Amino acid sequence: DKRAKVTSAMQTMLFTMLRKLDNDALNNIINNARDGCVPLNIIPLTTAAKLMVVIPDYNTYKNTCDGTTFTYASALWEIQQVVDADSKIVQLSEISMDNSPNLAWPLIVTALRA
Amino acid sequence: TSAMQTMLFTMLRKLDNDALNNIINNARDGCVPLNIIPLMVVI
Amino acid sequence: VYRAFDIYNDKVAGFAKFLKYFVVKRTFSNYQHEETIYNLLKDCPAVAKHDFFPHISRQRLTKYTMADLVYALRHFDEGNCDTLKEILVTYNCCDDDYFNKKDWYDFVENPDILRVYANLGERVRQALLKTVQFCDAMRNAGIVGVLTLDNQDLNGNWYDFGDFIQTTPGSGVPVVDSYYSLLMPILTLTRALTAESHVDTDLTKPYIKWDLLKYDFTEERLKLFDRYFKYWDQTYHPNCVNCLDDRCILHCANFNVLFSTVFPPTSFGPLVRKIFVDGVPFVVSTGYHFRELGVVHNQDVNLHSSRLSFKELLVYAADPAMHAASGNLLLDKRTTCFSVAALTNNVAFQTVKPGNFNKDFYDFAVSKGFFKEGSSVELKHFFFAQDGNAAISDYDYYRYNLPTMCDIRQLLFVVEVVDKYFDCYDGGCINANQVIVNNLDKSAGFPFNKWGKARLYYDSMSYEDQDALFAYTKRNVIPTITQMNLKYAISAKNRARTVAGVSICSTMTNRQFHQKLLKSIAATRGATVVIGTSKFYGGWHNMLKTVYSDVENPHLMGWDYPKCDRAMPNMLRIMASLVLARKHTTCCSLSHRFYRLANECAQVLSEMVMCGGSLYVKPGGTSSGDATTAYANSVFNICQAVTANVNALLSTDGNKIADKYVRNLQHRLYECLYRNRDVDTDFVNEFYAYLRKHFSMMILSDDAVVCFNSTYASQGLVASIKNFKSVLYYQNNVFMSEAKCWTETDLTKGPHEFCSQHTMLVKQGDDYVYLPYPDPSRILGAGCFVDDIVKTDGTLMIERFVSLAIDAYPLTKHPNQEYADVFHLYLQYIRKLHDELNTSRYWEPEFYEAMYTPHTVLQ
Amino acid sequence: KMSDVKCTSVVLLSVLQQLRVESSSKLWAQCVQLHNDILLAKDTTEAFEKMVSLLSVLLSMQGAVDINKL
Ligand SMILES: O=C(N[C@@H](Cc1ccc(O)cc1)C(=O)O)c1cc(-c2ccccc2)c(=O)n2c1sc1ccc(OC3CCCCC3)cc12
Numbered sequence A: 001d002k003r004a005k006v007t008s009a010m011q012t013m014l015f016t017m018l019r020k021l022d023n024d025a026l027n028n029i030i031n032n033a034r035d036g037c038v039p040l041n042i043i044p045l046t047t048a049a050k051l052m053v054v055i056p057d058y059n060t061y062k063n064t065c066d067g068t069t070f071t072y073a074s075a076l077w078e079i080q081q082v083v084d085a086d087s088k089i090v091q092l093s094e095i096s097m098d099n100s101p102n103l104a105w106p107l108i109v110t111a112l113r114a
Numbered sequence B: 001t002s003a004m005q006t007m008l009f010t011m012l013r014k015l016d017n018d019a020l021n022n023i024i025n026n027a028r029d030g031c032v033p034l035n036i037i038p039l040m041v042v043i
Numbered sequence C: 001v002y003r004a005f006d007i008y009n010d011k012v013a014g015f016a017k018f019l020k021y022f023v024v025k026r027t028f029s030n031y032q033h034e035e036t037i038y039n040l041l042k043d044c045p046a047v048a049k050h051d052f053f054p055h056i057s058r059q060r061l062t063k064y065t066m067a068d069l070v071y072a073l074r075h076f077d078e079g080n081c082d083t084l085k086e087i088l089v090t091y092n093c094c095d096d097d098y099f100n101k102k103d104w105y106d107f108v109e110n111p112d113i114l115r116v117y118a119n120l121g122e123r124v125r126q127a128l129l130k131t132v133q134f135c136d137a138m139r140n141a142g143i144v145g146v147l148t149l150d151n152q153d154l155n156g157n158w159y160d161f162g163d164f165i166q167t168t169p170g171s172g173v174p175v176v177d178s179y180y181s182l183l184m185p186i187l188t189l190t191r192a193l194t195a196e197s198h199v200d201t202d203l204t205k206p207y208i209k210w211d212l213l214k215y216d217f218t219e220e221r222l223k224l225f226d227r228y229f230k231y232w233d234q235t236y237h238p239n240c241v242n243c244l245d246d247r248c249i250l251h252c253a254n255f256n257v258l259f260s261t262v263f264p265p266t267s268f269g270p271l272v273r274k275i276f277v278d279g280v281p282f283v284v285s286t287g288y289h290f291r292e293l294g295v296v297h298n299q300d301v302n303l304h305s306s307r308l309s310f311k312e313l314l315v316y317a318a319d320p321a322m323h324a325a326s327g328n329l330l331l332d333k334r335t336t337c338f339s340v341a342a343l344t345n346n347v348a349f350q351t352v353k354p355g356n357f358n359k360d361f362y363d364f365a366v367s368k369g370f371f372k373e374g375s376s377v378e379l380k381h382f383f384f385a386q387d388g389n390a391a392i393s394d395y396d397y398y399r400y401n402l403p404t405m406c407d408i409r410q411l412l413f414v415v416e417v418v419d420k421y422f423d424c425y426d427g428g429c430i431n432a433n434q435v436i437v438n439n440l441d442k443s444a445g446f447p448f449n450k451w452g453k454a455r456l457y458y459d460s461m462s463y464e465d466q467d468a469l470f471a472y473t474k475r476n477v478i479p480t481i482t483q484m485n486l487k488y489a490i491s492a493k494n495r496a497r498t499v500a501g502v503s504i505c506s507t508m509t510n511r512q513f514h515q516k517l518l519k520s521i522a523a524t525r526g527a528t529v530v531i532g533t534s535k536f537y538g539g540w541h542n543m544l545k546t547v548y549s550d551v552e553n554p555h556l557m558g559w560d561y562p563k564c565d566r567a568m569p570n571m572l573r574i575m576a577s578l579v580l581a582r583k584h585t586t587c588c589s590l591s592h593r594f595y596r597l598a599n600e601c602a603q604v605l606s607e608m609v610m611c612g613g614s615l616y617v618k619p620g621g622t623s624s625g626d627a628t629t630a631y632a633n634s635v636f637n638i639c640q641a642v643t644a645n646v647n648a649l650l651s652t653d654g655n656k657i658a659d660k661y662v663r664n665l666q667h668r669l670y671e672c673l674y675r676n677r678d679v680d681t682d683f684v685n686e687f688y689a690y691l692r693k694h695f696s697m698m699i700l701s702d703d704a705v706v707c708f709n710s711t712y713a714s715q716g717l718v719a720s721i722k723n724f725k726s727v728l729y730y731q732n733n734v735f736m737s738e739a740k741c742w743t744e745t746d747l748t749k750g751p752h753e754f755c756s757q758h759t760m761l762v763k764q765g766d767d768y769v770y771l772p773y774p775d776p777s778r779i780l781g782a783g784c785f786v787d788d789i790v791k792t793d794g795t796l797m798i799e800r801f802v803s804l805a806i807d808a809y810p811l812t813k814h815p816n817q818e819y820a821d822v823f824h825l826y827l828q829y830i831r832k833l834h835d836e837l838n839t840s841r842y843w844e845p846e847f848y849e850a851m852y853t854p855h856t857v858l859q
Numbered sequence D: 001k002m003s004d005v006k007c008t009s010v011v012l013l014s015v016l017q018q019l020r021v022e023s024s025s026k027l028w029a030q031c032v033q034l035h036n037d038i039l040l041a042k043d044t045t046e047a048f049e050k051m052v053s054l055l056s057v058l059l060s061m062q063g064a065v066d067i068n069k070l
């Protein structure tokens, strides 16, 4: 009974979590290893097509996400949909040192690999 | 669930502090502020 | 002047301060002996220049030696820390006015001190290299002798070639047990091996572009060991799988702690591989790269499995490989903790509500004369509130955990002594049907907490599946995930509080491993560790009398561990785990016990934490959700106490110890420490006996009360309060101020505070006994404010008050009338509450009288 | 008059949090700061100005519990 339900839930989770990772990137990484064994930390680093940046203040934003593109994890990233701690959408033109007291810090800056 | 606010206001009356009762009376007829008081009003 | 020395000869031994550029000194035989050795050992660039002038001129030395730096940092005392200041300012590590700041020495306050210490790292690393060069020349020239820290200056040049003796060339063997062992704590405090991260070990060139796919580093580790610890005369296993006993595991894990600071942080953690299930490819952990235990490869690796059984599914669900592979790369700028990934498209912020003030009780209390403006009993404990960025702020306190390398020769002796304290208990492996589970409702951890608590999984699994799962863990590693949440608490401070829910996979196997031992300790009365001994029915009185056993000139003492759960080094936690597993000398083999150790180290030491909505890497510290954390804390507590006594008894001059037995105990303590690599079971008994007589400990998790012979402590034969401060500085990276430490000279008044409780000697039945009472503010605070689950039913309110009344009854005997009035207020309120709704009736004082009378131990 | 003001501030946040004030990060952070300051306060005057600030925050929000009725 309960064993059956928990088994079903675990199977569903594992299979759903598989429908969003398998790709040419991961396969390329796996075949570049000595025996297909790699550290777990570098998988999302070199394979993730989505990047989330939680910005605490405005100095950090200057120093990481100025303009519309930035370099991180040895890759070029392009910014879209910046969001505040109140979960409202933020426009790139609103991120300025004089406007900085009005914004609900920290800011979630999302980026795609480019 | 409104009992909490009634108890709040009974406590405020029991304190009978000058500033708190002043502000409560001001808002009594609907004259309420909009922002936090620093350490602007309507009407 | 006083300079630190490391001395061991036929009359005195220890590491203490004694009394004594172009240094000079003043016998014919020695002058001839030293000069010949120097000439045979001159062309080596790792020694200081010497001249022949009846005096031995010693040219171009520094003001302070490596011993002073080691001693100063190992016996730090902010009251008298001048020698440390001169060394730092002298070598451009900081500015002299830097010491005008408050808490400049403190690690938690002003964490910039770490940068100041790191300025000595390159200087220290140069000292290590010179030692290998020096030992190389001595080996080639055929010279035997002991290398001592005092004979090496801060520039690395060696000197004082008098202890050595000639031998046939090419067969020299230098003894470095004392040199390296005492120096290890400073290697990580100064980050000596920082230069190894650059292209050619040069601090002016870019960092090595390590291949992201590399994980092994075994050859790199061996090369690091061979470059710095070449003549360290004990086989070092880069992967601790190859060690022969737990004494080796501690030996080799200590080295891996130092060497793991040079390799990229992305190379550690679970090692994944692509396996196929019925043709579909998963990614699963088929190994693990520990910073301490090296690389561990699972032995049961299977591919193309037709179907996954319940046991197989549990391992895969708990494995973070699938969770981290399917998430987004995360770059969290709020924290300095390495982040693996985010598992959600938005970061989640959680807040802590305010307290639920109970007006009813408050209005009743004031009518009874309480809270009068000016009384000694007031409100100081409240449910504090927290804003959105509190959990991550709380998690960021793990920055206080730093890679700490231990004095291995000292730790390998302290473990034997700490082992005796646990030698009166029985334990070992037990089957799935012998395990008793209390509080089944504990969270099962991420992701298991999505579908229920620990009750569900324990019910679903059959005894065989649990048994196989435990057997599985004895040949593989299961790196589970822990989830940290925020908890409501009554406190006098607004610091946030968090509770960690460890993975169910880790708890099931741990209980089968430790439950037998844990129960044995909890069921024992009269031992040093007091866990599971109720304070009721005279227990507090019996506990105190056990502490008071036979101490000759007793005073009581207490201390605390700042940020204990966050700053505990990984070496000490691994040590605590090995001591607990020593009972499995018949239910497990060497290989079996290693795969057990690797499982806790990957599950409750450096596992992955699901804080907020994303995934981070925990650098260390204890997990409040683990069942063995309280007992592991006790082992850590005793280890720090024994370390304090060892440092106290070896840092005191043996010439001025008027006693004879103690001085013999000192000399032999040094031998078993930095010589005699075998465990001297005999001497381990005398030291354990010596401690029990003169240092009686009543230890509960990270809290202790010590009845210690004052005379011995006064003259340095036993740990004092200062000794604990010194140990915590160089073994915990925390400064422990005396403001939270108490000492008491009169035993009639019991311990000032133990487990947050006070003691008062009171008269019952023509006999004086000890009763434990709390601070009244806590008792009142917990009455005025409640966590909002009691409002549903009044019964929960009654049980809350009776529990408070039981702990409040002893106040009736307090001399202060206000205190005694507190219990009556609670009793009267209980009467009212009971009214609205012979000694078994909780609304009379007789019920609360029985709880503290030994005559009836009935529950 | 330490206990009365502290209990009043506690119940004041109890009310505020029920008005869904969690949704404003800045305002909720400010309210929590004031509340913790009041609870940690040892002087009556400090508690007074912090309490009036918190009450003004509460009472500015219109459409909340009716005040004219009281
Ligand atoms: O969280 C706790 N107390 C509240 C206040 C409270 C809660 C319930 C209550 O009526 C009265 C006051 C707080 O300080 O925020 C609490 C209370 C109690 C408690 C409740 C009733 C009677 C006796 C003890 C309590 O037992 N505990 C807590 S927090 C807590 C943490 C660890 C813990 O270890 C024990 C577990 C069981 C045996 C082995 C070690 C216990 C523990």
Ligand SMILES: O=C(N[C@@H](Cc1ccc(O)cc1)C(=O)O)c1cc(-c2ccccc2)c(=O)n2c1sc1ccc(OC3CCCCC3)cc12
Pocket: C489, C490, C491, C492, C493, C533, C534, C535, C700, C755, C756, C774, C778, C779, C782, C807
């Ligand atoms: O640490 C404690 N309180 C924290 C809050 C806290 C900490 C941990 C936790 O998860 C829950 C809340 C605070 O005051 O800041 C605490 C409080 C109280 C307490 C609470 C309300 C009224 C009276 C006493 C308390 O009673 N205790 C604590 S720590 C603590 C440790 C052990 C303990 O049991 C004794 C029983 C007899 C033998 C020796 C062990 C009790 C105990």
Ligand SMILES: O=C(N[C@@H](Cc1ccc(O)cc1)C(=O)O)c1cc(-c2ccccc2)c(=O)n2c1sc1ccc(OC3CCCCC3)cc12
Pocket: C530, C531, C532, C533, C630, C700, C701, C782, C803, C804, C807
């Ligand atoms: O911190 C606590 N426990 C630790 C360590 C421990 C302590 C004693 C023990 O054998 C076993 C383990 C833990 O397991 O996490 C603790 C323990 C106990 C406890 C001790 C012995 C028997 C039953 C309960 C405990 O009672 N408490 C704690 S922390 C704690 C915090 C608040 C608290 O409120 C009570 C206090 C008394 C009046 C009503 C409200 C209680 C409380």
